[PDB]
Each structure stands twice: as C-alpha cells, then as structure tokens.
C-alpha cells in the first residue's frame, strides 16, 4: 500500500483484460496505490480501483 502520493497520466486507452483491472482513457489521471514488479500497478480513478499496465502511464 503505497505511502507516497504518486499520480500518473494515461498514454493510451486501456480496456481491462480482467474484472480486477482498471479501464481508462488516454489523458486520464490515476492515483497509484500499489506498485509491484511485473509491470502492473494498482490505482484509482473516479472511485474505481484496479490493476493496470505501468507502461501505459507517465508519472506526473
Ligand atoms: Cl476513464
Ligand atoms: Cl479521466
Ligand atoms: Hg503484464
Ligand atoms: Hg475511471
Ligand atoms: Hg476523472
């Protein structure tokens, strides 16, 4: 559970590949909540929480 206040911006549109993943549109800002090796981070956006590809975002 990330303690710092990391925010990222989506570089692409992402359709969740699983129910536990975050769908989002290019330009959306995501608040990172978990960061695990493997390329998938967990995050929040508009009250929704889930995993997403870390290579789809740019740290703000
Ligand atoms: Cl969205
Ligand atoms: Cl948005
Ligand atoms: Hg992956
Ligand atoms: Hg969203
Ligand atoms: Hg939003």
Swiss-Prot record:
<comment type="subunit">
    <text>Interacts with PAK kinases through the SH3 domain. Interacts with unphosphorylated PAK1. Interacts with ITCH. Interacts with SCRIB; interaction is direct and may play a role in regulation of apoptosis. Interacts with GIT1 and TGFB1I1. Interacts with FRMPD4 (via N-terminus). Interacts with CaMK1. Interacts with BIN2. Interacts with PTK2/FAK1 and RAC1. Interacts with PARVB. Interacts with YWHAZ. Interacts (via PH domain) with NOX1 (via FAD-binding FR-type domain).</text>
</comment>
<feature type="domain" description="SH3">
    <location>
        <begin position="4"/>
        <end position="60"/>
    </location>
</feature>
<protein>
    <recommendedName>
        <fullName>Rho guanine nucleotide exchange factor 7</fullName>
    </recommendedName>
</protein>
<comment type="function">
    <text>Acts as a RAC1 guanine nucleotide exchange factor (GEF) and can induce membrane ruffling. May function as a positive regulator of apoptosis. Functions in cell migration, attachment and cell spreading. Promotes targeting of RAC1 to focal adhesions. Downstream of NMDA receptors and CaMKK-CaMK1 signaling cascade, promotes the formation of spines and synapses in hippocampal neurons.</text>
</comment>
<feature type="modified residue" description="Phosphoserine">
    <location>
        <position position="4"/>
    </location>
</feature>
